[PDB]
Amino acid sequence: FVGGFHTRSESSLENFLGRAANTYRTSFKTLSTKPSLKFASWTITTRKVAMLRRKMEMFTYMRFDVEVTFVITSSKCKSDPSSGSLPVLTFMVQYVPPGGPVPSSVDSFSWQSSTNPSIFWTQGNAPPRMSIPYMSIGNAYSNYYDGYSHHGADGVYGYNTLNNQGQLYFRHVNSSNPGAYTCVVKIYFKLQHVKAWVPRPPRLCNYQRAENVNFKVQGVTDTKESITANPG
């Protein structure tokens, strides 16, 4: 190449880890007999997306802010065609910080708690966006925890209670006579202002569980026919 083309800005922490990814998709409805189908929930975690988890786990401790963008689409269910009228749907995205009240239905009071920040969003606008700061009581998040959550027979190995980042809840904001609609929400995740400590070997084996490091034994690399190099 040219006289000094040596570039490594793409392997900096921010460019390695600061890429918006789709970490969860789910649906909720305006009308249903089953109450749990009328709202959606998601505990904020990176451990259920394999590609992000592997990259994040080359480090032991981390600090970052999180930027969340919501891509929300809706469709009409199959029902009576008299409701050709489509008043524009409004949505509520609720962040519940660590320690906040959690809703049990669409009618729970926790949808109105002044300490759960919410976005109210109507279809046809730019997608809603919200940022969450660094949320731990401790000084860093931990990707690995070689300990027990508490001293009991109910302690969980590898569970650090200080990695709690909150939850997100989704429901329609209905008027008196809503129609039957289904909405799918895609959550987009971006890490900001990332710091990391104590690098680790990349994960070799397949991920088995979202909550621990369990693995099936895997060979260190793939095989070749001979140890020597032969002139083809």
Partner: protein, 250 residues
């Protein structure tokens, strides 16, 4: 003959080769929390215990032809030793660095290579991927736990296949952690100085293993017929800058 030096800490003395190199983990020497002794020290006083600064020598292990490796979980490896072990019971919070010596007793007629590595937060996987490891499978204090050559199938045990290092990574990549190689034709000991490494300034020493010491033979032991059939390996630990929560009124 090579120069040797004697080190006395408290009421213990060991000898080391002056030509032995020391690995300081991440280049950081252990120290106290003194840099942040502002107002927080009034509502959260801490006290040192300098009588924990002595050499604790564990039970030696025998490096054999069929040996796959050993590991020791720390703080936990010293829970039954002395004033250090007693302080783990009396103080709810603590922090400490360490000086670790790993020495081999081998002759010039023995061959083999070991990796000595200190792995912070060495979370180990279970031998059944739908279950969870019991505490006894992770450590038993002073007694060393062993790796195996291949996969095991214990119900609640550790997956101890050595080439995955019980963590699901390629064992050849463990040089990213503070480490020293022992090649029996060039050297027979390793010294690693470990600072305190955690996401919080202090923690409970019975609940959390801060790091794990691993001794893994990459090249197996071999010798001629009639020679000693094993090489003893001795681990010696000296806590550095141990600090605990205060027990007095404000």
């Amino acid at each position: 003959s090579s120069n040797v030096r004697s080190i006395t800490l408290g009421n213990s003395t060991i000898t080391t080769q002056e030509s032995s190199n020391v690995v300081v983990g991440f280049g950081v020497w252990p120290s106290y929390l003194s840099k942040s002794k502002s107002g927080s020290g009034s509502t959260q006083p801490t006290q040192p215990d300098t009588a924990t600064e002595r050499f604790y020598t564990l039970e030696s292990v025998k490096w054999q032809k069929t040996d796959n490796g050993w590991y020791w979980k720390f703080p936990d490896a010293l829970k039954d030793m002395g004033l250090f072990g007693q302080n783990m019971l009396y103080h709810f919070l603590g922090r400490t660095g360490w000086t670790i010596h790993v020495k081999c007793e081998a002759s010039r007629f023995f061959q083999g290579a070991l990796l000595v590595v200190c792995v912070p937060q060495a979370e180990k996987g279970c031998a059944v991927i739908t279950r969870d490891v019991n505490a006894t499978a992770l450590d038993e204090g002073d007694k060393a736990k062993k790796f195996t050559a291949g996969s095991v199938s214990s119900q609640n045990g550790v997956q101890t296949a050595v080439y995955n290092a019980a963590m699901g990574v390629a064992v050849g990549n463990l040089t990213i952690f503070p480490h020293q190689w022992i090649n029996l034709k060039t050297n027979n000991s390793a010294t690693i100085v470990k600072p305190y490494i955690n996401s919080i300034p202090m923690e409970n020493m019975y609940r959390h293993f801060n790091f794990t010491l691993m001794v893994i033979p990459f090249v197996p032991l071999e010798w001629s017929v009639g020679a000693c059939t094993y090489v003893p390996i001795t681990v010696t630990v000296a806590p550095q800058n141990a600090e605990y929560i205060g027990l007095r009124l404000a």
